[PDB]
Design a protein around this ligand. Structure first.
Ligand SMILES: *[C@@](C)(CO)[C@](*)(O)[C@H](CC(C)C)NC(=O)[C@H](Cc1ccccc1)NC(=O)[C@H](CC(C)C)NC(=O)[C@H](CCc1ccccc1)NC(=O)CN1CCOCC1
Ligand SMILES: *[C@@](C)(CO)[C@](*)(O)[C@H](CC(C)C)NC(=O)[C@H](Cc1ccccc1)NC(=O)[C@H](CC(C)C)NC(=O)[C@H](CCc1ccccc1)NC(=O)CN1CCOCC1
Ligand SMILES: *[C@@](C)(CO)[C@](*)(O)[C@H](CC(C)C)NC(=O)[C@H](Cc1ccccc1)NC(=O)[C@H](CC(C)C)NC(=O)[C@H](CCc1ccccc1)NC(=O)CN1CCOCC1
Ligand SMILES: [Cl-]
Ligand SMILES: [Mg+2]
Ligand SMILES: [Mg+2]
Lengths: 212, 222, 233, 196, 195, 222, 204, 125, 195
């Protein structure tokens, strides 16, 4: 996997690949690695497929029960901590989960929380998670500014996944984009790397290592 | 693999399947496991494919040089002795399991050799992953004083038992008959009971389906 | 986690036109030591089922007791215990298959391979296999251990598929089983000459044959075999 | 394996089963474990088939070369050559060999050579996996200066029990008689010896 | 030994190599030059097992310098890289192999072209527009995929290189104490003193 | 030490059409190099127009199918005979599989049927419960052989429109039940040729709004 | 630490009507890291073509070794080596290193200049010859290639049709393997002309 | 364990034990709560039959549950300590999991839930 | 989690804690506050196994805050440190122990004295004038042995602390991305924003 999400002037960008592997066997190219918890909360998944999917699907149920009981949408902090406290109970049992809880609330504003299976929980502006996280970091960090436009931010997130999809053997398939604003998350389409790479190469003039 | 050997009235017959595996994958569906050591001494091989081929060629080469040196037709016991001493020296690391048979001035012979260098004598023998399926048939149907046509039938039946019941064996049946006073006849693909059925569809693509980036003429000449 | 101690070898079986045949030798091996020679490894349940068991004998004796207890339990408050509500081969099998899998799932398996041979109430032949892993499968011929490697090939020459079952008589089928038992005596180092054979027919019922012996063996050719290559004497 | 050699009035008799195994599978049910290293010096082979054959082949070569130079070797000499191979290559060999031969001066002699490579001269010797089950029987029934018929019966009854209890032993009972008269091969089939 | 980078541009090859030498929980030196000049227009940076690296580099350097004297002629970067690969290809099946990864940057005077070769300890050679060994590649390759252009100048290459070092200094766990940068072109080899 | 798992081999295949869906699987059951059965079905009708197969370790496969069949039964009892939708069944199966996260069912599971819009559906599961709806999926021993062929022939991957300079892709379209069965049969005959654990017979279950139909075809028995 | 699957890669060869085709991917990586997208795995010595998958250092070493041996062959024999003869040479050379082998999966392809017969062959790492009428496969996606070739292939294909079949076999197999892909090359070989085509494939 | 159902319904549809618990509250010293525009004030009565008291150490009538919530009461003094303790623990538990202090409604809902549980649990009054 | 230091001076306790959070070959965060306020005049820094550290710190924080509410009284640093030690002393013989090392800096209002306690994951407590956990101690202890005086001011303590961080930045292999410094005195806890 490769997944990222960064915070900026116009909210939060979230971008992920869609590959799933069993060793060197490419099992799937169409996996959905953004879990839609509610209209204001997103969750990225990386690591063990079943672990991530099962427990973030479970997280959505816990968040639903919160707003039924409290008559109010759960905070991004509280949501992330439910998940982190869950995986901490299973610490040592061998769960493999690298997740990022992204969302907006009134009291917090746009917020991103990194959570992993060995119990680490971190608030932050930029995070890249997965086997190809380093490849995404390289492109993202070197082009990141707080004052990016919504248009430029969406592209940088897309381009960072594309970079990782190219170099990392265990990442690829397609890019799924999301934009989180004060009004909630907005889906910005599925982008197959098969067409996106050549489109980016020609227009941008990058990827000169590859035989054109 | 499945390989067998059966003695009869005036000679000996050996047989083998034609499957070659690479893990659970069938690499070759029609490989030849019957090897010629000398004109009238042939060898069926099971185990490590490269080793059975290599060890049989080496001994076959030295048998030829020996035959020229001594001005005599080579003997099966010479091939047997040279093989077992070679295999023993390498302590089983050369994974060749062989059924050695043939005719020579002494008569007709049938032996087996294992990777560690032990040899056995018999009227009927079987080696390889499907040796138990083959040996079951041999034990059920073998008798003393077999004819040529009976021995070929018994041998090919023993290989068939391996083909059907052992996953390590399959495809076709190779046979070699070595009769006294006659030329040895190598019957490549003696039986072919595993023919691929007609495919339901042709997958011939329309020309231009594959996307191309560059073309160029390659220079093979000087 | 176990290791098997006193063990029983191959159990072989096949279907024929009117019923099923099953056989197993009377040996209880203790490693390479052929320790016990009076061991019955075919156990009838009612007059329509025979359970053939290989592997650990202590676990076999446990299974005997379970089957014995199953007959008792079925008879309770059951006026039709010897008629419509009698134990079927399929009932007996599924019970064992449930136990075998439950035990493997608790990492404490019954170290056996079992073949339940019988005839159902509607006349259909029943023949199904189950082992220490809870793995189950059915086939016109079934065999355990060395039987799977040597018997099945021979028995499949008689009944290679479903359509060959009506064409196979009890005479032909028994002959193939007795032949298979001889081959196993030749080639299985933990086998014995003495064995038991059971026929469950839809017409003639259960015929249980004890104290059989492997006979008509070929050993004469051994005298002609000298040395291991050269040797002439 | 089950193997034995027994001295008696007229000479010595070697005896063996005919089973070769790969795990629990019987690779050969008609094996000949009694093998000739010289005219009237033979050996019983137990342990690795590959090792014992390799060894026996070398000993036969040595004794043939001995005979060309110094004439017929003694049974003791043959056992010494077996020992030298088994002892010096003890780390790489699995061979339990019994050496038996007939001299005219020394009559019948039996030397046994276990795994270690040590030599032991005995009136009779037993070896192989199935020998464990007949120590009691053979000790109680063996007598010195037996007749040919008595010694054949002693070996037949002994190997019959060894075969009966040892799964690694079976098939036919081969025997080889070594006397002044010459070399005689004997064979005994299951139908005879099993019901003893 | 950790970070070694290489970038081939229009008219030169630029090699950046980390200055830190660490053993245990101590940085023993922060001014280490992880490179040797094989010939006037060929430079080899190196990284790997302690001791092996310098021993191998100097052994190669000695052999190339011997060739230069014997023939009164400078070997091409392609020829040097092939010699180096063969040495490592022998090494890997030795009793104790050289655990050394290298980059060979050179300027071919006959072709008038810069050339960058990346060779690992197994003897795996590849000619590249940009290269890296160790964990460095996991950041720099994707970064260069984006920003690199084949027709760049040396000054543009140095800015592109600064961008790599900045990213490594931000995301790498270990402190590698900056880099020594060297440029290989038609005029030979020279070191950038202020980086 | 006791190993609670085993490999019973075999391979399975699911393909979805516009108003139908197929779930195929060979009938061979094996352990190591031995054949256990030439006809042991592992594709099952579970009710509510849902077909299911759990290929891998047969004991776990049978246990899972048995439990899901039972899950369907109790779904009817607890919710007024309501039809279990394919999407609901999939989620239910995830909880069955993940329930044994720390002692898994060693199986690749595939279910097939029709979604609530009446369109063909195929779902696939890993051993611990991660699932995904797809037009296409092969599972089991020969999945690596069959799957890329399906990508090419079902989803038209790497196929471009002739003469468009590799710029226009081959347009996606649903396949007819006749065309799908051709691809299934060719996939299995190809897999039988090159994989030793695949053969004997092929059993296809086709699911339409009318019900569940079956089709059987012979495969090579070597 | 499995030599055969560190660098990754694939080679496939097919026969047609009076022609052969051999094709390979372009990836060279270090496990997950993709390093080079120009690493060709097919070489040629005269009219005989050799493809090599496996450990990249050995791919390079063996190419240089067979160039060495075929050059001496040509000088002494005064003719180009033929595919049948070259196949034997590869087998000899690999088995020479029986107990310390090159970690490779070579594939010979070419047309015999005397008889005009199309010829292909494969080997394991210790030199066992796998001759075939239809096709030979090799590399980290060999399972995938076996599946594609066995279904897509048919005998007596024309060069233009054979190109489409082998190209689709390679591409769809490479897309199901993480360590293969990143570009591809296809050689179409006729009796006295050879066309080399670079394929457009997904770059992930 | 002591299982007896002490709180049960009577023919007229009343739970007498709950109603007799109200009588205990009616016996307790008066407590008052008044909330203003920007504040809340909790007034409490202390009976003056007890002289020679030590007002430094005597348990105060108003208790802090957290730094922002307070709880006063009327009724059995010993019983009030159990509710206050449970409420104080739940206040810290809420901060730990939700990373935010309890609302006054939530804390009340919790305390009220505890009181309710003791009206239909066996063995307790 | 790596570097945590503590220095008790005349009238205060100063805790310095590294900002880096690393997993694998990536620095995930460079602004991490590795401390929790247990009470108005007691601060606990922590370092150790991922997940365990924060889980343990917050659990202690919750317990101390519960005590403060119950008694309307602040526990002494000595009392808090003893409570923490006992928790770790239980932990070590549990099925899965907390792998967390802590420093507890506090100001005792009754004694009018600063106090620094160093407790490891085994439950080994010691009161010290200066303390450190992990590899930090191997540099800082000897440095403080030399430069530390018991009658120093808070400003002198911060300069002494700068001297430690400089040495660590020079000789430590890993980049720990600087430190967050906090001061505990009679007026409570406050953070030095510019360090
Ligand atoms: C990038 C793409 C790769 O790391 C991402 O990190 C993705 C995350 C996405 C899918 C959410 N990770 C994976 O794809 C993940 C990698 C992985 C594998 C194993 C453990 C941890 C991480 N892959 C999986 O989880 C696959 C997904 C399937 C193929 C759709 N599942 C498996 O590999 C399963 C379950 C593994 C498992 C985990 C825990 C306990 C038991 C099992 N295993 C198999 O399918 C085994 N199999 C048998 C023979 O066929 C080959 C595969
Ligand atoms: C029956 C069919 C047994 O299944 C027969 O015994 C035949 C004998 C015939 C071919 C003469 N045996 C095989 O087919 C034999 C089975 C086997 C496999 C592995 C070890 C021993 C026996 N198969 C082979 O020898 C193949 C021949 C190929 C298909 C041309 N070779 C391999 O499978 C090699 C094994 C090489 C080897 C080296 C050192 C010691 C033992 C064996 N394996 C590979 O090439 C696998 N791998 C591919 C990726 O690259 C690295 C190697
Ligand atoms: C009785 C049977 C036992 O003492 C006799 O002593 C005979 C002696 C006669 C034959 C001269 N011994 C055997 O039959 C002997 C038993 C044995 C087995 C293993 C080590 C030492 C002794 N059997 C063999 O030597 C067979 C003969 C073959 C089938 C022709 N060889 C094997 O079983 C080989 C031997 C490999 C070996 C291992 C260690 C030292 C020397 C050689 N083993 C295998 O092939 C392994 N086999 C693979 C299949 O799974 C089961 C094990
Ligand atoms: Cl022997
Ligand atoms: Mg990739
Ligand atoms: Mg077969």
């Amino acid at each position: 996997t490769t997944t990222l999400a960064f915070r900026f002037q116009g909210g939060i960008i979230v971008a992920v690949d869609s590959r799933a592997t069993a060793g060197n066997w490419v099992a799937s190219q169409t996996v959905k690695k953004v879990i839609e918890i509610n209209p204001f909360l997103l969750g990225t998944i990386a690591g063990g497929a079943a672990d991530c999917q099962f427990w973030e699907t479970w997280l959505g149920s816990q968040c639903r029960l919160h707003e039924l009981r409290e008559k109010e949408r759960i905070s991004v902090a509280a949501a992330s901590k439910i998940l982190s406290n869950l995986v901490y109970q299973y610490k040592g049992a061998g769960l493999s989960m690298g997740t990022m809880i992204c969302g907006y609330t009134r009291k917090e504003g746009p917020t991103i929380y990194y959570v992993d299976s060995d119990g680490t929980r971190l608030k932050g502006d930029i995070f890249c998670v997965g086997s190809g996280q380093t490849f995404a970091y390289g492109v993202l960090d070197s082009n990141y500014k707080w004052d990016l436009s919504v248009e430029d931010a969406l592209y940088l997130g897309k381009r960072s996944i594309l970079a990782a999809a190219h170099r990392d053997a265990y990442s690829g398939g397609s890019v799924n984009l999301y934009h989180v604003t004060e009004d909630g998350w907005i889906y910005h389409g599925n982008h197959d790397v098969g067409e996106l790479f050549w489109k980016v190469k020609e227009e941008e003039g990058s990827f000169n290592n590859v035989i054109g | 693999t499945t390989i067998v050997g059966v003695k009869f009235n005036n000679g000996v017959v050996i047989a083998a399947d034609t499957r070659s595996t690479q893990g659970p994958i069938v690499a070759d569906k029609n490989c030849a496991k019957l090897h010629r050591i000398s004109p009238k001494i042939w060898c069926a091989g099971a185990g490590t494919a490269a080793d059975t081929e290599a060890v049989t060629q080496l001994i076959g080469s030295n048998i030829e040089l020996h035959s020229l040196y001594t001005s005599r037709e080579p003997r099966v016991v010479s091939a047997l002795q040279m093989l077992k001493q070679h295999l023993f020296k390498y302590q089983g690391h050369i994974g060749a399991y062989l059924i050695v048979a043939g005719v020579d001035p002494t008569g007709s012979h049938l032996f087996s050799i294992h990777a560690h260098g032990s040899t056995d004598v018999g009227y009927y023998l079987s080696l390889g992953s499907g040796s138990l399926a083959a040996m079951a048939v041999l034990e059920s149907h073998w008798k003393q004083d077999l004819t040529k046509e009976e021995a070929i039938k018994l041998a090919s039946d023993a290989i068939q038992a391996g083909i059907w019941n052992d996953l390590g064996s399959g495809s076709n049946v190779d046979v070699c008959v070595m009769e006294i006073g006659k030329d040895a006849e190598y019957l490549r693909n003696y039986l072919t009971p595993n023919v691929r059925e007609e495919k339901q569809k042709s997958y011939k693509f329309p020309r231009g389906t594959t996307a191309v980036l560059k073309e160029s003429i390659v220079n093979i000449c000087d | 986690t176990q290791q098997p101690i006193v063990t029983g070898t191959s159990v072989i079986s096949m279907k024929y036109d009117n019923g099923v045949i099953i056989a197993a030798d009377n040996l209880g091996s203790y490693g390479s030591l052929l320790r016990f020679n009076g061991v019955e490894r075919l156990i009838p349940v009612g007059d329509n089922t025979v359970v053939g068991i290989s592997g650990d004998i202590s676990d076999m004796q446990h299974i005997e007791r379970l089957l014995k207890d199953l007959v008792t339990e079925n008879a309770y408050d059951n006026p039709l215990a010897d008629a419509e509500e009698a134990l079927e081969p399929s009932y007996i099998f599924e019970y064992l298959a449930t136990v075998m899998y439950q035990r493997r799932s608790k990492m404490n398996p019954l170290w056996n391979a079992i073949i339940v041979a019988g005839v159902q109430s509607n006349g259909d032949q029943f023949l199904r296999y189950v082992n220490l892993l809870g793995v189950t499968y059915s086939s016109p011929t079934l065999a355990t251990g060395f039987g799977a490697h040597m018997a099945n090939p021979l028995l499949r020459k008689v009944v290679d598929r479903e359509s060959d079952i009506p064409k196979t008589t009890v005479q032909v089928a028994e002959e193939a089983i007795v032949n298979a038992m001889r081959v196993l005596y030749y080639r299985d180092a933990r086998s014995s000459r003495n064995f038991s054979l059971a026929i469950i027919d839809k017409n003639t019922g259960l015929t249980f044959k004890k104290n059989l012996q492997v006979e008509n063996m070929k050993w004469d050719f051994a005298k002609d075999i000298k040395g291991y290559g050269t040797q002439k004497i | 394996t089950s193997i034995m050699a027994v001295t008696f009035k007229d000479g010595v008799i070697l005896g063996a089963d005919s089973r070769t195994t790969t795990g629990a599978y019987i690779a050969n049910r008609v094996t000949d474990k009694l093998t000739r290293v010289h005219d009237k010096i033979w050996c019983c082979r137990s342990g690795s088939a590959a090792d014992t054959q390799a060894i026996a082949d070398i000993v036969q070569y040595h004794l043939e070369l001995y005979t060309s130079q110094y004439g017929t070797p003694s049974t003791e000499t043959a056992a010494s050559v077996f020992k030298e191979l088994c002892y010096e290559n003890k780390d790489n060999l699995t061979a339990g060999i019994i050496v038996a031969g007939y001299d005219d001066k020394n009559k019948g002699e039996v030397y046994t050579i276990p795994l270690g490579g040590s030599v032991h001269k005995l009136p009779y010797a037993i070896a192989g996996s199935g020998s464990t089950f007949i120590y009691g029987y053979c000790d109680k029934n063996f007598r010195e200066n037996m007749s040919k018929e008595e010694t054949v019966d002693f070996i037949k009854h002994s190997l019959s029990q060894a075969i009966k209890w040892d799964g690694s032993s079976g098939g036919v009972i081969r025997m080889v008689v070594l006397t002044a008269a010459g070399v005689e091969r004997l064979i005994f089939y299951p139908d005879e010896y099993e019901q003893l | 030994m950790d970070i070694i980078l290489g970038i081939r541009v229009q008219d030169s090859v630029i090699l950046a190599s980390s200055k830190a030498v660490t053993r245990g929980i101590s940085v023993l030196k922060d001014s280490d030059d992880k490179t040797r000049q094989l010939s006037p227009h060929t430079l080899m940076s190196f990284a790997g097992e302690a001791g092996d690296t310098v021993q191998f580099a100097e052994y190669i350097q000695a052999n190339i310098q011997l060739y230069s004297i014997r023939e009164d002629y400078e070997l091409s970067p392609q020829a040097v890289s092939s010699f180096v690969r063969q040495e490592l290809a022998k090494s890997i099946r030795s009793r104790r192999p050289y655990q050394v990864n290298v980059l060979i940057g050179g300027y071919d005077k006959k072709k008038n072209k810069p050339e960058l070769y990346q060779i690992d300890y197994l003897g795996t050679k590849v000619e590249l527009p940009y290269g890296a060994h160790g964990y460095s590649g996991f950041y720099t390759f994707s970064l260069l995929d984006h920003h690199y252009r084949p027709d760049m100048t040396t000054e543009e290459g140095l800015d592109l290189l600064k961008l790599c070092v900045q990213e490594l200094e931000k995301r790498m766990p270990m402190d590698f104490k900056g880099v020594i940068v060297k440029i290989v072109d038609k005029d030979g080899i020279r070191q950038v003193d202020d980086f | 030490q006791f190993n609670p798992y085993g490999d019973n081999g075999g391979t399975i295949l699911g393909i979805a059409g516009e108003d139908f869906a197929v779930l195929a699987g060979d009938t061979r059951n094996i352990t190591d190099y031995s054949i256990n059965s030439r006809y042991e079905p592992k594709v099952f009708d579970c009710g509510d127009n849902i077909v299911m197969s759990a290929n891998g370790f047969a004991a776990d496969g049978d246990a899972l199918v048995k439990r899901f069949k039972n899950s369907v039964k109790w779904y009817h009892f607890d919710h007024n005979d309501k039809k279990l939708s394919i999407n609901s069944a999939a989620r239910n199966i995830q909880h069955l599989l993940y329930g044994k996260r720390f002692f898994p069912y060693y199986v690749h599971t595939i279910i097939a049927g029709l979604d609530e819009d009446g369109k063909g559906a195929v779902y696939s599961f890993d051993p611990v419960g991660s699932y995904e709806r797809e037009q296409c999926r092969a599972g089991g021993a020969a999945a690596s052989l069959i799957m890329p062929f399906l990508d090419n022939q079902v989803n038209f991957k790497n196929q471009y429109e002739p003469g468009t300079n590799g710029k226009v892709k081959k347009p996606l379209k649903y396949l007819s039940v006749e065309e799908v069965i051709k691809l299934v049969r060719d996939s299995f005959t190809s897999a039988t040729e090159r994989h030793i654990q695949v053969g004997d017979g092929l059993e296809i279950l086709i699911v339409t709004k009318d019900g569940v139909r079956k089709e059987f075809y012979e495969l090579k028995r070597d | 630490s499995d030599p055969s699957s560190i660098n990754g890669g694939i080679v496939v060869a097919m026969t047609g009507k009076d022609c052969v085709a051999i094709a390979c991917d372009l990836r060279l990586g270090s496990q997950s890291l993709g390093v080079s997208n120009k690493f060709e795995k097919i070489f040629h010595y005269g009219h005989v073509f050799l493809g090599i998958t496996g450990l990249a250092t050995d791919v390079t070493t063996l190419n240089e070794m067979f160039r060495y041996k075929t050059n001496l062959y040509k000088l002494k024999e005064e003719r180009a080596i033929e595919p049948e003869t070259f196949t034997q040479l590869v087998s000899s050379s690999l088995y020479e290193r029986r107990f310390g082998p090159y970690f490779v999966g070579p594939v010979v392809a070419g047309i015999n200049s005397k008889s005009g017969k199309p010829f292909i062959a494969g080997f394991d790492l210790i030199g066992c010859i796998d001759e075939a009428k239809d096709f030979i496969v090799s590399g980290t996606a060999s399972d995938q290639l076996f599946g594609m070739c066995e279904s897509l292939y048919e005998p007596n294909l024309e060069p233009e049709d054979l190109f489409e079949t082998i190209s689709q076999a390679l591409l769809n197999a490479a897309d199901r393997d993480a360590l293969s892909g990143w570009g591809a090359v296809v050689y179409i070989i006729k009796k006295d002309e050879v066309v080399k085509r670079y394929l457009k494939m997904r770059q992930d | 364990g002591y299982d007896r159902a002490l709180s049960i319904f009577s023919p007229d549809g009343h739970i007498f034990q709950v109603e007799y618990a109200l009588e205990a509250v009616k016996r307790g010293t008066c407590a008052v709560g008044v909330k203003g525009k920007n504040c809340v004030v909790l007034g409490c009565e202390r009976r003056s039959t007890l002289k020679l008291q030590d007002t430094r150490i005597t348990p105060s009538k108003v208790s802090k549950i957290d730094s922002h919530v307070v709880l006063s009461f009327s009724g059995l003094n010993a019983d009030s300590r159990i509710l206050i303790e449970k409420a104080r623990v739940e206040a810290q538990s809420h901060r730990l999991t939700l990373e935010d202090p309890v609302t006054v409604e939530y804390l009340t809902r919790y305390v009220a839930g505890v009181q309710q549980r003791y009206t239909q649990s066996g063995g307790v009054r």
